[PDB]
Amino acid sequence: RFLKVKNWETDVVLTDTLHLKSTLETGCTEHICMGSIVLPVRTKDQLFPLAKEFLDQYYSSIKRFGSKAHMDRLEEVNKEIESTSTYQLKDTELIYGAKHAWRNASRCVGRIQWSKLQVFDARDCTTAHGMFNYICNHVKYATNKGNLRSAITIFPQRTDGKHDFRVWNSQLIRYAGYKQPDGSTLGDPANVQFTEICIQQGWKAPRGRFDVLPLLLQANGNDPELFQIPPELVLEVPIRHPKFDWFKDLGLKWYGLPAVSNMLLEIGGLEFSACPFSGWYMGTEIGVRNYCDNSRYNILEEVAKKMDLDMRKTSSLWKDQALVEINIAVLYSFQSDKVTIVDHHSATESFIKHMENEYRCRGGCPADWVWIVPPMSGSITPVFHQEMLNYRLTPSFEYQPDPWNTHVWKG
Amino acid sequence: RFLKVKNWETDVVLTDTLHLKSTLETGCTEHICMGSIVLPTKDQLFPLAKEFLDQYYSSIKRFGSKAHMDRLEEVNKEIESTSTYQLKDTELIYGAKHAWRNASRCVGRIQWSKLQVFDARDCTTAHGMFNYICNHVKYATNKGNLRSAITIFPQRTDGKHDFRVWNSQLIRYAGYKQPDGSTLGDPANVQFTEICIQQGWKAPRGRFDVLPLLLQANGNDPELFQIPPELVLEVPIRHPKFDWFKDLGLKWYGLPAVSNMLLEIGGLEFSACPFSGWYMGTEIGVRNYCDNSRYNILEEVAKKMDLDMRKTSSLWKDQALVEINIAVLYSFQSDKVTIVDHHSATESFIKHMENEYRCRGGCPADWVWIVPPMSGSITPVFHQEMLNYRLTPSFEYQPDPWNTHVW
Ligand code: HEM
Ligand code: HEM
Ligand SMILES: CNCc1cccc(OCc2ccc3ccc(N)nc3c2)c1
Ligand SMILES: CNCc1cccc(OCc2ccc3ccc(N)nc3c2)c1
Ligand SMILES: C[C@H](O)[C@H](O)[C@H]1CNc2nc(N)[nH]c(=O)c2N1
Ligand SMILES: C[C@H](O)[C@H](O)[C@H]1CNc2nc(N)[nH]c(=O)c2N1
Ligand SMILES: [Zn+2]
Structure with missing residues (x-):
């Protein structure tokens, strides 16, 4: 069964076949969409088919599906599972797994980079x-x-969930x-x-x-x-603004390295509960969310005062205006200090190219529109107009x- | 089966029971979410009529009444007889207001009950x-x-008329x-x-x-x-700081009046039911003026502001987009034409959501459409989990x- 997505700005239509390889659930049903919901110790019983599916994938990727190396590896994993109740990944399999988990991360706009990931084996x-x-x-x-x-460090996998x-x-x-x-x-x-x-x-x-x-x-x-x-x-990077000299006096800075460390990496049924990974910031993560979310540093007000905007009526769009300058400042500061950052225009534009490449070479690219579209200026980025299909592939980050x-x- | 939605800005959690009433299909499945996809006989008819009359008579606290049962009987007979049926004016007005109430993509639904219905049947x-x-x-x-108003033309018969x-x-x-x-x-x-x-x-x-x-x-x-x-x-568009803005020769009309949708009430189909409310600023300034496949004036506006359009990282598009949207709101407000900004409208929608959760058990909402096309996360709806599902009466x-x- 084939599925089509349409870009409403270009009329480019793409065809998804990859969603057929999806097993895990979405949260959605024929009667309800949970597309905007943020978040909607294992036995041998289920382990080998999960191992087998991964290894079939890996051996296809290296063009060795059905080979003796493939079959021997399947045999070896089976035996290790029934003898020890788990199994160990080879380095090749680990590296492949981690990269594919990133490739499969439907909420990640930065995936064009997925094949360039430095894997540190900390097992x-x-x-x-x-x-x-x-x-x-x-x-x-x-x-x-x-x-x-980009890098990831992978600590030992879960055993009984008590270690x-x-x-x-x-x-x-x-x-x-x-x-x-x-x-x-x-x-x-x-x-x-x-x-x-x-x-x-x-x-x-x-x-x-x-x-x-x-x-x-x-x-x-x-x-x-x-x-x-x-x-x-x-x-760390001191935040200043290219034209506003008072901006430095807000006393703001941010760290250069975004490095998420609370996620779980799933590969071939194995669970890696400590797998810190890092890339680089898209400007809006700091400039829109980290500074301007009300539940965060919440500096829109003070920035707006200093700009002397009409803050009496919201219809002056003083919030919008201040938000843009803060985001300009973040990008300027990082670039000026030669710290890697990407603006939301560049990143979304790269994502579209990546996405289309993925459709052609891979039969699809799962993508979560709700998270892909940047938190400011949505429709002036090309992802806004892009239909997407969201579904879950393994290996994955959970x-x-x-x-x-x-x-x-313990005490 | 009883679903919760959380606001991540306020931690407020609402519980949705209304979704269990849903009949139509979303397009999504357990294996795939299609949330960002733009477009996902007598025996068919009477249950459809029944369902509607059931909710209509419940709404007027006359569920299980002579009047209710009689109307059910009357419509059933009329269906059996005429192979269709006609709405009472009261049912028509109720149906139209509820089609709006159920429009999961509409941020302006706080006004749903104040709709003027013109019966043009x-x-x-x-x-x-x-x-x-x-x-x-x-x-x-x-x-x-x-x-706000809707004008309702005669319902479909055999789809040839x-x-x-x-x-x-x-x-x-x-x-x-x-x-x-x-x-x-x-x-x-x-x-x-x-x-x-x-x-x-x-x-x-x-x-x-x-x-x-x-x-x-x-x-x-x-x-x-x-x-x-x-x-x-119509409203001539000028900027309250940039006098050169008027030389762009831009104007827009004050009345957004969507005329191409289908109104379904109690299985009956109204292929011609133009309706209108008033504009949210971004509809014109963000989408109509700055969409590439539309008036696409970002370039010229940016030039007039002499922004460094050399690199995307200067965020010149963002700057221009804001000013354009400032100007749209400024022009309408100056000429006293009703308009709402995306902040006010999204704030209103949150209140309406809470009203509906409180007084109806939920509120079908399509985040992808409710979140405005600029400044998303500085509006309260961005941080609001929503549940999307199809209820009838509806616009299709x-x-x-x-x-x-x-x-
Ligand atoms: C190299 C530059 C990268 C950029 C610019 C980037 C960009 C982003 C952004 C903006 C988000 C949304 C974050 C939010 O708003 O909370 C995100 C999500 C995500 N990213 Fe990337 N990313 C990059 C690299 C990576 C890498 C190296 C990995 C893993 C190896 C990764 C995995 C993920 C995952 C799993 C999510 C979803 C997080 C969630 O579900 O909350 N990304 N990315
Ligand atoms: C009174 C002020 C109103 C405001 C501020 C408002 C606002 C909006 C906005 C911003 C959208 C997104 C539209 C787009 O991006 O193209 C929308 C969609 C929609 N509105 Fe409302 N609206 C109002 C009145 C009404 C009325 C009176 C009706 C019907 C009686 C209605 C029914 C709908 C429907 C069915 C959609 C979805 C159409 C689609 O799926 O493309 N609205 N509304
Ligand atoms: C529940 N959402 C909040 C939440 C919880 C746990 C992890 C997480 O990750 C967001 C995330 C993940 C990976 C990223 C990689 C690079 C980057 N610039 N941002 C990134 C942002 C976000
Ligand atoms: C699918 N997008 C194109 C498309 C097709 C059919 C109807 C439609 O209407 C959007 C719409 C509907 C009602 C509105 C009422 C008020 C308003 N300000 N905008 C409104 C916008 C939009
Ligand atoms: C309720 C809503 O789903 C939630 O606020 C989401 C929306 N989209 C997002 N998109 C990104 N990139 N990051 C986020 O934290 C969120 N939050
Ligand atoms: C591809 C995507 O579904 C498309 O651009 C949608 C996204 N959200 C939208 N939201 C609103 N209010 N109006 C729209 O036309 C759209 N278009
Ligand atoms: Zn869905």
Whole structure:
């Protein structure tokens, strides 16, 4: 069964055959669409077919489907599963898996880069200190003095779910958030809960507006431990505006390396609960969401005052105006410091090309319109006018519950 | 089976039971979501009638009453007899208001109950239709103090006697393809502008020519009619800081009056039911003016502002897009023509959502359409989880008449 998507700006029609290889559920039914819903210990019983499907995929990709190497590998995995209840991926399979998980991430606009991913195998890691070391190396390699390089570090896979490796931080580098007695928030409100945990775990908080959070690291199902990323490894960028000289006085900065660390990587049925990965920022992530979301730094007001906009009526579009200047400032600051960033026009334009290439070479490209379209200026980017089809392929990146809600404390 | 939606800005969680009433299909499946896809007999009829009458009589607190049962009996008999049936005025008004109430893509639904319904089911000719439409336009315009309205033409019989308004809106600008390769006026209307000419229209070949009406009564061939200019309220577009803006020669009409949809009530089909409300600023400034496949004026506006259009990263398009949208709102408000900005409208919709969750058990909503085409995440709807599902009465898309007309 074939499915067509239409770009309403170009009338380019594309045909999806890849959605047929999809197994996992969407949340949607014939009677309801959950397209805008944010989020809608395993036995041998289901493991081998999941392993087999992955290995069929891998061996097709390397043009060896049906080969003796293919068959022997299938046999070998089967035996290891029934003997040990799990299996180990080869390095080749791991690398292939991680890249394909990124390729399959329907909410990621940056996927044109998917084949250039540096995979760090951390499956020999055993302790939190070991995790700290690997992560430091990840940060140094990925940052590369501002010339950012996509990377992922993969810690050991889940066994019984009682020995999980987890990075408790949602991103490797994030700023602290502190709730004040007067109800106000100092720093990043998104991080208040996590900041509190760190403080409780013994972190001495400087209590500033931009304190880089410590790493909270869990190895082998043990209680997490605190570590401080060496500051010389944390690249930051002062935010100024090219024409507005007062903008620097807002005292804003951001870190250069977006490195998501709370997701779960699924490959051939194996679960990698600690797999921190990094790319580089699209400007709007910082300039629209991180600064201008009301539940975040929320600086639209102060920026608007300083611009002397008519803030009396919303129909002056003072919010829109201030939002653009902040986003201009973010891009300017990063470019000026030679730190890799991409604007939402460039990234969406690249995504469309990538998407079309994926349709031709792969039979489709699953894409979540709700997340692909940038959070400002939607319809003046070409993704807005692009019909997309959303469905789930493995290998994949999945959400997982926050470890503090599930963890069994050792003491 | 009882579904929750969360607002991630406020943590407010609403619970949806209304979705369980849904009948029609979304296009999505368990394996694939089609949320961003633009277009996904007597025995059929009586359950459809029943369902509607059931909800109508429940709405007036007379569910399971003599009046209810009688009407059910009467309609059942009339279906058995006539192979169709007619709505009571009360049912017609209720049905139309609820079609709007159910329009999951409409951000303006907080106004749903205040719809003026014009029953035009006595209409027999295109001239008649023209008269009715002129009355609608005049009433809804109200000298700039716009009032929502719908005019309902006779329901489908055997699909050979269809009433249709061939225009997609009662008021739209013509589009012409030049030999020069470009396009003058509105590119979206190039084909319809052609069919007007093919049918006998005399285009002024301008840039903002109000298109004539193309009216089809009783399945007959469509006829042309020129809306009295005095009934077409237009707004010259000027910027409250940039005096050069007026030299762009831009204007827009005050009355958005969608005329190409199909109204379904109780299984009955109204192929001709033009309706109108008032504009959200972005509809004109973002989509109509700055869409590449539309007036596409971003380039020229940017130049006039002397922005560094060398690199996308200067965000010059974004800057121009804002000012353009400032100007649209400024012009309408100055001329006292009703308009709403995307902030006010989205805020209103959140309140309406909460009202509906509170008083109806939910509110079908298509995030992809509700979130405005600029400044998305600084409007409250962006952070609002929504559930999309189809309820009846409803407005539906329908094929363009020319692709279908048995001439
Ligand atoms: C290299 C430059 C990259 C750019 C510019 C980019 C861009 C983005 C953006 C803007 C989002 C939406 C984030 C949000 O609004 O919350 C996103 C989501 C996502 N990205 Fe990428 N990305 C890049 C690299 C990567 C890499 C290297 C990976 C993994 C190896 C990845 C995997 C994902 C996943 C799984 C999501 C969905 C997150 C979720 O479900 O909440 N991306 N990306
Ligand atoms: C009174 C003020 C109103 C406002 C501000 C408003 C706003 C909007 C907007 C912005 C859209 C998106 C349209 C687009 O991007 O093309 C829309 C769609 C829609 N509106 Fe409303 N509207 C109003 C009144 C009405 C009325 C009176 C009706 C019917 C009686 C209606 C029915 C619909 C329907 C069916 C759609 C979806 C059409 C489609 O699927 O393309 N609206 N509305
Ligand atoms: C539930 N949504 C919030 C949430 C929770 C957990 C991870 C996450 O990731 C967003 C994300 C993921 C990967 C990215 C890679 C690069 C980049 N510039 N941004 C990126 C942003 C987002
Ligand atoms: C599918 N998009 C094109 C298309 C086809 C058919 C109807 C339609 O109408 C959109 C629409 C409908 C009703 C509206 C009422 C008020 C308003 N300001 N805009 C409105 C916009 C739009
Ligand atoms: C409710 C809604 O689904 C939610 O706010 C989503 C919308 N689209 C998004 N898109 C991106 N890229 N990132 C996000 O966090 C969100 N949030
Ligand atoms: C491809 C995509 O579905 C298309 O551009 C949609 C997206 N959202 C929209 N939203 C509104 N309000 N109006 C539209 O015409 C569209 N078009
Ligand atoms: Zn869906």
